[PDB]
Amino acid sequence: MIGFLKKRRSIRKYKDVEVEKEKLDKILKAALLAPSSKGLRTWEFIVVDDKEKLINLSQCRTKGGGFFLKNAPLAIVIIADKEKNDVWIEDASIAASYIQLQAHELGLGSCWIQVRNRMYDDNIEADKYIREELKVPSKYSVECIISIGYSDEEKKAYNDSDLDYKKVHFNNF
């Protein structure tokens, strides 16, 4: 598990290879098993493998952040029913991380694209642009997009020298 996590690096460049149905199905199962506040499961997942839609979504932040989505084979857009609970950010973040870890176990690379609190441009929220592109009703907000694919880039694993132990406090700050 520690070694599993040391090998998890964010991947932004992917082989031209589709994510198999069998793998996508396990990733979704992991997402649906995420602990949520009050067990309410505020999240919903939009699976995107249509190439033109992925191109559209890669522009969700015109000043950058998700451009590499254009050449990913798969994305899961994580949204949340913000009316149902006010810790939907937590809920969606936990599901996101489960998606990414399950993908890592299946030999896939992934990257989180931040949407919440990000601008599409000076006039429009990234949340708004994604809801238009995916026909999402206004009661939902978009937390993030996780792009998923077979890695086409080299990244080093973390090791124990990367661990910032100064960030651990005992019984008080």
Next chain:
Amino acid sequence: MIGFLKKRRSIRKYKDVEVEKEKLDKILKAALLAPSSKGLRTWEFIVVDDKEKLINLSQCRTKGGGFFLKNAPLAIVIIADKEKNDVWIEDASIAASYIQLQAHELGLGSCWIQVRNRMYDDNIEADKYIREELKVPSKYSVECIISIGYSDEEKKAYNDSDLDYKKVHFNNF
């Protein structure tokens, strides 16, 4: 891994047994390996095993939420430097999920205690109460407490049938 996650259930009743140092250490290593926005690692961790501190912290929401913490052998309070990034909520949430998963792999139970957006009572934020209790400077915000220990209650594992496929959308909402 899906089997791993199906057996992960929140635990709020614990054996009267310390969490041994070798397991604490692996839990902290998983937390320190968590992906963060811009690699900024806005979070910090306060390990609490002092019984009196645990009692104090179990009162952080006087109307309920973390009362069981008084009977836990261990807690990790996840705080974040909220001036470092605005998505410290996400950062902290991912680290807390890594903590809970590594606790699970080591045969321990755990439970998330929500702090952000929660009140100590009608006048005081739970965040502010905890920062006073743990002497946390004001630039930090408290995300949640993870109580950790050996489980003293039985919990049914999740089923394939428990999964919410209504929450999966393909190519559009």
